[PDB]
Amino acid sequence: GAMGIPQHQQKHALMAIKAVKRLKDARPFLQPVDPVALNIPLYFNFIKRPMDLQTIERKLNANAYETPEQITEDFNLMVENSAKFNGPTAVITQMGRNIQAAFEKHMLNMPAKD
């Protein structure tokens, strides 16, 4: 329909995800957490709603976000999941905070809808 964010906003967010993916600090966040391959079997006992950068990109490409703020909601979910599972001051979480700060700066430059 016409309820997903329009192309200019979609493309700006896709650019921001591309940019974040060039940060080496994004490496833990590039793909969904696989608790078997990573041997962290309790992951889904703590994490109800997993999120990662590829999933955000896929949702952008599927025109599934209704507002730019919903993209930020998913990004914050991704990093808060790490804070809960790995810990607020764990290396992975702090790498998440670093990419989150960069993402926020790009999201401040989102073009207006109209």
Contact 52, 78 (CB under 8 A): yes
Resolution in Å equals 1.1
- Domain total of the chain: 1
Question: Which residue type is seen at 34?
Answer: D
Q: How was this structure determined?
A: X-ray
Residue 74 CA from chain centroid, whole number: 5
Residue 114 lies in a domain: no
Q: How many CA atoms lie within 13 A of 99 on its CB side?
A: 29
- CA-wise closest residue to 7 among 51, 61, 59, 73: 61
- How many angstroms separate the CA atoms of 114 and 18, rounded? 24
Residue 113 lies in a domain: no
Contact 111, 41 (CB under 8 A): no
Backbone angles phi, psi at 67, to 5 degrees: -140, 160
Number of H helices, E strands in the chain: 5, 0
- Two tokens at 74? 């998913």
Looking at residue 44, which CATH number applies to its domain?
Answer: 1.20.920.10
Q: How far are the Cα atoms of 2, 34, 104 from residue 52, in angstroms, in the given order?
A: 26, 11, 16
Residue 1 lies in a domain: no
